[PDB]
């Protein structure tokens, strides 16, 4: 969580919606056997604080960078806590 951190992460997100949003391949094709130079691969200093592998999740509701659920977005605490009330359609406590 920590607003100061949350925001610090938000940056790591927008950057993808820019550089990686398209220019990510603008050099990719020139990276794999598609002859083929190295200049682009060499002057490759565009994606720094930006990387499609440096973005964390953090409980959507809160912001815990652990115990995340793709199908949702929150962490065990919120999810369970919320599901209890019913902010999630069809999510009754499982018990085969």
């Amino acid at each position: 969580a920590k607003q100061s951190m949350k925001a610090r992460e938000v940056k790591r997100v927008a950057l993808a919606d820019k550089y990686f949003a398209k220019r990510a391949e603008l050099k990719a094709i020139i990276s794999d056997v598609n002859a083929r130079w190295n200049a682009v691969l060499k002057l490759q200093t565009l994606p720094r604080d930006s990387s499609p592998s440096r973005q964390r999740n953090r409980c959507r509701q809160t912001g815990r960078p652990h115990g995340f659920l793709r199908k949702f977005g929150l962490s065990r605490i919120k999810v369970r806590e919320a599901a209890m009330r019913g902010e999630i359609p069809g999510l009754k406590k499982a018990s085969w």
């Binding site: 190295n38 691969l41 060499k42 002057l43 490759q44 200093t45």
Partner: protein
């Protein structure tokens, strides 16, 4: 080292190394990219690899290639 076809390197240094190699030599080049594969062109160049505190001036012979400045530079402590 392990870089299939086309090893990785940090331009930051390339534009500092040969950039200063052409004109004889001078003071040790303060590196920082321990994750960079040693270049056979930076032969015995007066540099120094960062160890998390300072930089250690090391040189490569005609037997070190795929290796990175990290190898020839300690980053921990023991004994």
């Amino acid at each position: 080292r392990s870089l299939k076809k086309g090893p990785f390197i940090d331009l930051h240094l390339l534009k500092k190394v040969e950039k200063a190699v052409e004109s004889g030599d001078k003071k040790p080049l303060r590196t920082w990219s321990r994750r960079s594969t040693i270049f056979p062109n930076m032969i015995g160049l007066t540099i120094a690899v960062h160890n998390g505190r300072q930089h250690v001036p090391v040189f490569v012979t005609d037997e070190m290639v795929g290796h990175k400045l990290g190898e020839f530079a300690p980053t921990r402590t023991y004994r």
